[PDB]
Structures are given as structure tokens and as C-alpha cells.
RNA sequence: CGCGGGAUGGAGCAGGAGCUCGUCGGGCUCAUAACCCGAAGGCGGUGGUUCAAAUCCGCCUCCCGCAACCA
RNA sequence: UGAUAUUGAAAUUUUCUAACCCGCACCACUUAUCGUGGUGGGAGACAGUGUCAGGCGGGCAGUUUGA
RNA sequence: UGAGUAGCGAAAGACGGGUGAGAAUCCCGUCCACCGAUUGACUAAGGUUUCCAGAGGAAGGCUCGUCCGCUCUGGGUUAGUCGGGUCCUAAGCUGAGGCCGACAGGCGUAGGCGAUGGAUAACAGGUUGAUAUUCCUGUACCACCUAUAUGGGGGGACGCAGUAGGAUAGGCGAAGCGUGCGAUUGGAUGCACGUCUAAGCAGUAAGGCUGCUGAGCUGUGAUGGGGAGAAUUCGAGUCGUUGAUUUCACACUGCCGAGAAAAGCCUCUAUAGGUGCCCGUACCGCAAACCGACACAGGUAGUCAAGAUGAGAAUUCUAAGGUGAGCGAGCGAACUCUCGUUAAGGAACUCGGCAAAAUGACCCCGUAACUUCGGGAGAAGGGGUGCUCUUAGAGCCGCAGUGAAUAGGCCCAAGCGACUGUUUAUCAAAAACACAGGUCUCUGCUAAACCGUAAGGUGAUGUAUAGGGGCUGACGCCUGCCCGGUGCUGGAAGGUUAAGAGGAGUGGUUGAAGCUACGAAUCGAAGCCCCAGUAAACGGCGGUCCUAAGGUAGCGAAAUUCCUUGUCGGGUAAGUUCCGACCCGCACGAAAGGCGUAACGAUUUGGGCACUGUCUCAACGAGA
RNA sequence: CUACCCUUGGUCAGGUUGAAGUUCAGGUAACACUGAAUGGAGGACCGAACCGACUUACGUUGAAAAGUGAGCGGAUGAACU
RNA sequence: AUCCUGAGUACGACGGAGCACGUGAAAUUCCGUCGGAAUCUGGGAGGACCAUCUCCUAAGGCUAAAUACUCUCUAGUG
RNA sequence: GCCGGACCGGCACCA
């Protein structure tokens, strides 16, 4: 049966990643969150 | 002419189509040709708000000369051509200087004819001038509502206005929809009536049709759920149940007018169209 | 099975008894009908409230309307 | 839908132009269907917008709907 | 605890030899078996070292393990030409100025980013444990470098179907050549394979289009290579037939639903030497490495496409190649599951013929009611298929000849829906939705409608033969009465009312004025009250009385009928279902359409034939 | 993932039926009309791939948190990807 | 007191808000809309308002300290 | 309750 999850390497990028999260106020607020929980990883 | 389909199939049955005798030339001018993705009835927010729109064949735009600003110079009919983005079929005329336009084929048309725009013109199918120069009683289509802008009345397959007076800056003209207005006697009009008539006689025949056309389903408000449309919901077939039929948005859709008060055209349209 | 409404000359309707048709007598007509003129004729019942009851109290004999279910 | 502000000028609703408006044409910025200016044309003290007011308003909302 | 219980995840293995402390399970061999429109081969995504060699056996592996996609150590991915960038644009995203918005921000112009598309120069062979159009060999091509010698136009550039051709790839046959082999089972002297070689460069060329294009062919490339082969040297590349799904080529014809952009490119205003970057390249890849918690019977885009049989990429057996499936050994109880057969009967089973049986290919006869004249139709129902010989006959054999496998069951009647299509991912596929068609209504364009606070948008680069909304639902015949009430449309300014205008007047305070709190006539819109119209608007179509008016056509115990298994007829031996009638319509009825309707249906319902382990009534056999 | 949409690509073994046109032949005053051949239309027919999910059996501490076996619907289109 | 001393301001009407205070007899402060003063013989406040008295002098600006907090640093405490 | 007609019709209604 086909599941949810089917990985592309640049949809996950363009939506999850570095970049887009600075795109916006919102994402950039992600990222400081998990900079305050001292997050290894803060972005895809 | 109008061709009738012989019911070989449950999908042919009664079904007709445009024979396009009066198509001369089944290919478009490549330097007229435009680019035209579709919308799907979906705005510059991607959210779709107008119903029923979506899928269809690929179309090509055709620049359309609707102004017909170009005066002294005759030109001549090169071809009638079908146009996918309008019920009228368009007529490509080259200009003595060389130039092609195109133009909405109007009515009588013939490869060969001259046309020619301006205030000296003749009177004639295809002449385009400004309604000051127009006689009472002519039979005229693709007319500007503002000098210079270009045509936007009377253009679909079929349509015509006629010429009824001349009223200081303004001239009286009935339209198709019967309602009689005035327009500034400096806009333009093309003598004639549309051609293409009997495009209004052709029987669809089938859902793969539409399709085709871009159409999408409609589905009826009364076989909706309560939260969907103000016809949702009752058990089995429902009549209306309100005092009156509902749009989808919650508006009376029988009889209810919609045109706004206070805009400038109240004093320049003469008689309703009923 | 629960709730409610009705019983008016002979007929259909009004409602502390009148309109129309029906009957009788006379007239008009060759005769009948229609029509015209006069006369008579009535509160479904059973007990009570009441100075006094079609009228109000409860019930009785039928008809009529809604409803008689969640399993 | 009315008043009032923007909002002016003359007759007695009509007129005018100059504010305001034009998803109107031409020109420049400018290889530009945005915008901004310029010129014409249309419209015009109306419209639009602000404040106040009356009306409609299961389109949407908060709730009530006894023992 | 349950308990040494359930399970150990689709299937064919056997033996010999080896290794080892230990072997059903690892290695080698032989035989056997399975896939083969694929269990084969190659790209992409995704994964990210799982790749290779040596070593190891704690844990992981559903058993075992000497083995491994596991552990240890050391290795492995080579590009001017392949894919991407230093080229182009699509949707979309972003956006200098700009427009809009409590803030945050939203939008948008020029421009920019952005392949799934366009452009663009390399082939063949060899080689490793692991890379190869990348390394090596041979032979090329492209861009740039050094020396000798900006506007116009065109083009790129495009759908879908079908047909006739050319060529080539590939298949088959003869063996023309070549290489082998030549048989201890009765016989013969026949048996089995091979039969090629690129880019580039010159010559040419079937065609196609109105000179431009054009698949392919020939030579060269190539005394090179690869080769069924013989013992490093030597070795054949020929005749016929068939023929593409590839290519010429979206070339040609036809059709309506009318089929990107931009750049590269085009056109008008030689030789010689040298240089050539970055990213990816391992391995898995219809899976034991991806998505499914698993070494999971699931899911995962494209390409290549052999023989016999055949219409076929169907069927069965095979080729190339790959695989024997990570628990086994016995036994051959009940019971369960999956298969095969079955006396006599043949739906008596059951809610219901559920399931199964039956039908089935090709060829020839032949085919009804009804019909929208297309259909219904493969209607139904019947005949023939083997093999040999002669040139349609004569023979031969079996129980049986499409001898296997694969391949419609059919008919009569009724309800519903016209039809193909769509739906409750995961208990409903339908009579529900959609539909073509009908009608009503809104909308004159900065349209109406819709999204958004707005700007900006969709509608539409459309313009009443158009766009939005409501209802109905092909087609045929049709669609009756009621405008009193509600809605909608249009009148009227008579009454009623708000802000605001207006100030008669009254009080508080100081004889006042002043300040102050109120404040009455009168004016002041829409709406409402009133009138009219409107039913394919919402609705309503009763009980002499009353109403706005009391059901027309058609239909009717119906998907509607409570009494009810109404009554009568048909079908059965027997029929609460079914069909046909009646009308007493509890409580049908004309676009929440009425009545019919050919065709269509994994629809619902009744009957019949065929057929059968569904059943009387079970029995035996195979496997898990 | 799923619903719908936008841009750009890809895929559909084989059989069958035989619409419109066209041509020839009859026929006419001229048309209508008719037969044969040609032609290849269709949300056409049968049926693999592919897309579904009607029935049934199995599974129901599954091989699988929706599957498998056998049949079944569509299969040039409102197709699938 | 001859001159100056903060004007679309103060203030008012309407609609709101902040004031412990729900429009109330509601003073006092602020916003939007619209109107709109006076000038030391002035102006504001003392809880509607008037008069008297009392206090004050808006419509310009600046100003440490006593106050609030702890991711930190130093030294310590339970 | 406020008002216009002959109760009717609009408006008003926070113990
Ligand atoms: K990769
Ligand atoms: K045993
Ligand atoms: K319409
Ligand atoms: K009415
Ligand atoms: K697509
Ligand atoms: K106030
Ligand atoms: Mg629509
Ligand atoms: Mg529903
Ligand atoms: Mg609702
Ligand atoms: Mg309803
Ligand atoms: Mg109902
Ligand atoms: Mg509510
Ligand atoms: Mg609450
Ligand atoms: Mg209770
Ligand atoms: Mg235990
Ligand atoms: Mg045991
Ligand atoms: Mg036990
Ligand atoms: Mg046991
Ligand atoms: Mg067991
Ligand atoms: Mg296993
Ligand atoms: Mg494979
Ligand atoms: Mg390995
Ligand atoms: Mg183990
Ligand atoms: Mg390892
Ligand atoms: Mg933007
Ligand atoms: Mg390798
Ligand atoms: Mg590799
Ligand atoms: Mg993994
Ligand atoms: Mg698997
Ligand atoms: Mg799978
Ligand atoms: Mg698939
Ligand atoms: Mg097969
Ligand atoms: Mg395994
Ligand atoms: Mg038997
Ligand atoms: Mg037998
Ligand atoms: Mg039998
Ligand atoms: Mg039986
Ligand atoms: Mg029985
Ligand atoms: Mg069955
Ligand atoms: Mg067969
Ligand atoms: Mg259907
Ligand atoms: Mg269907
Ligand atoms: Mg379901
Ligand atoms: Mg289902
Ligand atoms: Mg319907
Ligand atoms: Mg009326
Ligand atoms: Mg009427
Ligand atoms: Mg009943
Ligand atoms: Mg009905
Ligand atoms: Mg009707
Ligand atoms: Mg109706
Ligand atoms: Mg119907
Ligand atoms: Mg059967
Ligand atoms: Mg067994
Ligand atoms: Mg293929
Ligand atoms: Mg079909
Ligand atoms: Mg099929
Ligand atoms: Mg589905
Ligand atoms: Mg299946
Ligand atoms: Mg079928
Ligand atoms: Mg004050
Ligand atoms: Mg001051």
C-alpha cells in the first residue's frame, strides 16, 4: 500500500529548509526556538 | 451549416456540430499568437472563486484588433479563421503598408474584401467609424464605450446593435439584450452583425464536450449537506424549504436584483432590457 | 390508547333560535316544472349549577382532527 | 438609506468648472498592460471616503430552550 | 503465568567432494526443479558505504552457521564531449522603485530564479577484487588561444486519429562457407554450433515539401578489433525469406476540442602548436539496501522485448540470464484450509443457485420481439476442426481430433436510472452525484458573482449566440387549477420613524442679564403599513359550508396501500414474492416534473433452459 | 497521503464493428433517390498491459493497521501516469 | 499692566475609551467626526451646575535617587 | 405608552 511519506530531497529543502525558515517571520521564530532549547539540528 | 451527427453511439445521439464552411484558412497567423495559460476560475491567492472552470483543450490567445485605430489605410481580407477563445470566427486582413491584423469576422464577409476604419469611410460590413458619422438605423457591432479604448459590445457570435438616434455628444443605441443607452458619439463601431450565427444552435451532446470546453460540474445545492449550501440537507429529496432559492453564499438567487445604485451609466441607460 | 372538536325546524349552515331548500294551502300553465303569494313546523340524550339553560358542570350514543414511540 | 465633512461657482431641479474620480487615449520617466507626472477626453460638486443615524441582515457568532 | 504452547512470513530439492571444534543450512561439483512481457537486462527517484579484499562469530539473521546487507582492518567512485552548472525559458516563486495595510505584513512593474520542455562537441575495443562513453589503445569532434597564412524579419515551434509506403534492426531457412563432433541401446551416417566490427570522414541516396530537406547504403575508419575455434601464432563472415512496435515522420490524409515560451540558429541593416573548470559517478534500485517499526506475500516512473504456439506483449513449454526463497525430520488421526473425483437424482439447498458446474478459440451456416433505424446480435440455435496420400477426393487411428493450457452461459418478464462516467481511502458503487438537454433568474462591463481589510485578482485578455446562480435531467407526448399568505419585481409619497435642523417654553443660580440643565410646535430618507404583478418562485390544490383555489392529462395495493397475504386472472402439485387487471389513491400526479421509452447496468425483482456435491447424503484421494 | 487545479512529459498487446465524406454505376429537365467499392468516425464492441474494487473464499495476537486466491468493471478516454 | 506669557488649543455635541467608578446627579483624562473661546478687568480647578471664596497658571521640553528583574560574574548561605 | 386615520397602522418598551 502506498504511504504517507515518499522523500524528495528538494521538496523537503525548499519547504523545511534553512532558507525558507528565514523566508518568513514565522520560520525565523522556529529557529530561534530550537537555538533556545539548544537544538543540534535547527533546520532540514 | 449546422451538421447532424448520426446516433451511432449512446454519446452521439442528437448530437451536432458546426460544419466551418466559412473557415477558409485552418492555421493561425504566428505573429499574432500569444500565449494563454488557463486559471481555473483561481485568483492571484491560488484559491479558487469562480466555480466550474478547470482542464479544457490548450488554446492559443489571437491579438484582436478591437480598437481599429489604424485610418486611411485599406486592408484587405486575407482569411476567416477559427478562434478557440471567442464564439466568433476572426478575419485576418493585411493593411497596404503590409501589416496584419486581426479583426472580428463580422457577417458577409469574403476573401478579397476591402475594409477600411475612420470617419470618411464608407458605410459598408467591416468599416469601422465613430457613431457620430454612423446613420440612424444601422446595424452595427464591436462598439467602444470610451474613445480610443476599443470594442467591448456586441461582440459574440451572432451580435448586432442598432443605431436609433443622435442626442447632442450622445448617440441612442439598442443592444442584443434589448436595453437602449447612450454612447458617446466619438466612440467607434463596425458596421455589420457578427458572423458565426449558428453557434448558438449547436447541441454539446455529450459530458466529454464540456469537458473539452473547460467546463466542470456543477453540482445542485439541494443534493448538499447543511454546512455546504442553505439547500442541504432534509431526508430524501428535499423541496426548497425557504422562502426563497439560495445562492451557495447565503443569497436570494430568483429575481433578486444585483446591478449597484449610484453608478454613472443610470443616466445614460434609457430602457431596461425587460 | 392519550388529547380535542361537533349533534339546530324535514336538509345543509348561524348560534341562560335566524338564510336557503323541504312540507301544506292558493296562484300562474292545456298540464308539469320554473316562478309568485300565504300557513305550519326545531337545540342528541342522562343526571345537576342556576330566579331562569341550545347556552353552563360532568357523563352517555356516534362522527370528526393530531398522536399512539426509544428499544 | 439620510445628515455632515471633503465641497466650489450661477439661475430656479437646471447650468458651469476648478477640487475629487476614470481597470479612458496619447507622451515621458522607460526595451515596462505597475506607478508617477504632462496633455486631451469623460464625469463632476455627484461619486468615493471619514463621523453620526435609521433599516435589512441564521450569511456568521455567543447562548438559552424548567422540574 | 499461559508454555516448552502458538508461530518460525507464498515455492524443490538430492547426493558426492571440501573446510571446520562443530555442517540439512558455508564452498565446489553433478543431476533435478522454478521464472522467462520476466524471478532476465538497463535508466530515474529514494537510500547513503550497504560496494571490494582479508579476517571474525558475542549480539543481529525468526533454526543452524565455518556464512552474511552483521563485527574488525585496509581499500574502492578518474570526464572539454555522459547528466547538471559557466545557455534558454513554462507553471510557480521572488521582486529595485511602486500600490495597499493597527503592527506584523499583503500585492505588484521592470528584472530575476525556476525543468518535467528547448539548445548543445565521442565512438568502438581492452582492462581490475572493487571505476569506466571517465583509465588504456585506436580513431574523432567542439570551443577558445598563439603563429603561418544594433533594429528588422525568418526559424525554433509543437494537437488528435488514421492510412499507404521506403529503409533498417530483429526473426527464420538452406547449409554457401567455417569450426567441431561422429555416437557400443535396435537403426542411420548424420548431429551441433559460428557466420561480425562504431563514431567520424568522403560519395551517394528510397522518399517528402514547395531548390530545400531525407531515412538508409557504399567506401574509408579497419594489414585494427571481436570471433564458433587448433596447438604465443593461425581462423569463416553467403544466399534466400520474413520484417518491424525503430526511423523517414505528426511526412501524408482527415478531424475539432484548434493544439508553450525563450535562447541557441539564419538572414537583411586551411594548416600547425597549445588550452579546456566545478558538481555527480561506489553499491542497492519494481528491491533483504527505496516507502511500509521487520531480511514484511503490499506500493514504487521509464527503457530493452528471443524461439515453438498463436490475432496477440493471451496460453503452455523453453532462450538470454537468473533462482531453489534463512527452520527441518517424521507420520500420513480428528478438525480447518486449498485442490481432484463421485452411483441415482438434479436447486428437492438457501433469504437468494451463494459457491461450483456449465459456456468459451477459429471457420461456415443461421438469427426473434422491439427499435431512437444505429441497434437488439456473438441474439437464439446448428454444423467443421486429428493424421496420411492424390490434386475437392481417397484413406488411417482413438472413448475422445481448438485431444493440453488459455478464450461469452443463454432466454422471458418487471422496478429504477436514458446512456460512457463519479462516490462514502478502510462494512454502502446504488435507484445516490454528474451528464448532454430544458427552464427560470441575475448581469451593459471597473458587468453580475466570487477571494481579499485594502491594494490586487478570478470572471475574461471574455462582452448578452456572453458570464454567474436556482431547479429539472437523453429522447417522445406533455407539463392542469390557485397570486389569499410568504418571497421577488414595480408603483405611491398618505401615515409611522433616526441622526441632524429648529428653537416655543420651563427650571437651578445670581432684581436681572450671564452661565447652566432640559426643552415643545415644524422640517427630516430608506424601510414598514397600502396597491399591482409574478407559481419550471416559496407554497397550496378542502371540509349546502368555506376557500386563493379545491387535482386536468396520465398513472395507481405503486421504491407510495395502513387494513393486506385487498379482489380477480396467469404462472406452480402447492406462490405473503412475481406478472396482468380492478380502483375502495390510509397518504400518486405533472420541471423537489407526470406518463412512456430502443440502447445501456459487477443495479433491484420474478420465471425458464443448461449445469452441477447447493442438497437427498455423504464417500475417497492430493497437499498445507 | 489525499481533493482539485497549473505548467511540462510519458503510456495504452491484439481482435471486431464500419459514421460522415468520395468515386463509379443506375436515375432526373435539374435536383432528390438507390447499389457497389473506397473511407476509417465512435466518452463504439471483445480483450492483455495499466487503472479499478462487484461477488466470494481465506486471513481476523494477519505475510498485510485494509491484504491474498478465483472470478469481475473500464481499457482512444469525463483515460491512466 | 503700555506689550508679552504656548489656538484649530481649551471647550462643546455625537460615538467610544481610560479613571476602583458599568452613564450614572459623573466631576477629572484621552481618541475619532464636526463645531469652536478668552487674553491678567484673562484662564483652570475645588465630583452635575450657578454664585462667592480658596488654590492654581493648560495647550513647549529636560531631569539623577529611593523602585522593578537575573541568562550572567565574583564571594557566600540553607 | 407616542402619534395619524376609523379599534386599526407604524414607532417606543432594561422593576
Ligand atoms: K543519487
Ligand atoms: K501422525
Ligand atoms: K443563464
Ligand atoms: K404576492
Ligand atoms: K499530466
Ligand atoms: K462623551
Ligand atoms: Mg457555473
Ligand atoms: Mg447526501
Ligand atoms: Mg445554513
Ligand atoms: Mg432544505
Ligand atoms: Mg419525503
Ligand atoms: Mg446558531
Ligand atoms: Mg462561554
Ligand atoms: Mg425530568
Ligand atoms: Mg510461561
Ligand atoms: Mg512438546
Ligand atoms: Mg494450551
Ligand atoms: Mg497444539
Ligand atoms: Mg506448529
Ligand atoms: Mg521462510
Ligand atoms: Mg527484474
Ligand atoms: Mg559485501
Ligand atoms: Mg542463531
Ligand atoms: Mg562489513
Ligand atoms: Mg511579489
Ligand atoms: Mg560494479
Ligand atoms: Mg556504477
Ligand atoms: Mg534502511
Ligand atoms: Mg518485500
Ligand atoms: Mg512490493
Ligand atoms: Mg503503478
Ligand atoms: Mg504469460
Ligand atoms: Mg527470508
Ligand atoms: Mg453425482
Ligand atoms: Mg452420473
Ligand atoms: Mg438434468
Ligand atoms: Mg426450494
Ligand atoms: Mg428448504
Ligand atoms: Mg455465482
Ligand atoms: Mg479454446
Ligand atoms: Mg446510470
Ligand atoms: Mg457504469
Ligand atoms: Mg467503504
Ligand atoms: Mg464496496
Ligand atoms: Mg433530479
Ligand atoms: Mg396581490
Ligand atoms: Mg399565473
Ligand atoms: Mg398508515
Ligand atoms: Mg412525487
Ligand atoms: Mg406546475
Ligand atoms: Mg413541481
Ligand atoms: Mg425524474
Ligand atoms: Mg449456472
Ligand atoms: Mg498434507
Ligand atoms: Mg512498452
Ligand atoms: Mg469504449
Ligand atoms: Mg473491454
Ligand atoms: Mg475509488
Ligand atoms: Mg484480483
Ligand atoms: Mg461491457
Ligand atoms: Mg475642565
Ligand atoms: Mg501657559
Known sequence: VKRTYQPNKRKHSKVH?????MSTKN??????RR????????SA | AIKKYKPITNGRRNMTSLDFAEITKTTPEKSLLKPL??????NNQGKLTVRHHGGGHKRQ????????????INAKVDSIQYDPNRS??????????????YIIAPKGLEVGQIVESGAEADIKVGNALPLQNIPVGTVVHNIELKPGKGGQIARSAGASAQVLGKEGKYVLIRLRSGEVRMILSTCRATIGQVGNLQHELVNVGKAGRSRW???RPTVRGSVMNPNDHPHGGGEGRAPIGRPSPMSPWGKPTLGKKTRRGK????????????
Not at chain 1, 27 to 32: D, N, P, T
Not at chain 2, 61 to 72: E, Q, S, T
Open chain 1, 35 to 42: 537555538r533556545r532549547k539548544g537544538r543540534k539540528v535547527l
Open chain 1, 27 to 32: 520560520g525565523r521564530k522556529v529557529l530561534a
Open chain 2, 88 to 101: 466568433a470566427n476572426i478575419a485576418l486582413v493585411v493593411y497596404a503598408d503590409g501589416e496584419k491584423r
Open chain 2, 61 to 72: 490567445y489571437r491579438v484582436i484588433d478591437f480598437k481599429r485605430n489604424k485610418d486611411g
Open chain 1, 17 to 21: 529548509g534553512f532558507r525558507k525558515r
Open chain 2, 37 to 42: 495559460p488557463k486559471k481555473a476560475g483561481r
Open chain 2, 213 to 215: 470546453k473547460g467546463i
Open chain 2, 263 to 274: 453608478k454613472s451609466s443610470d443616466k445614460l441607460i434609457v430602457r431596461g432590457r425587460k
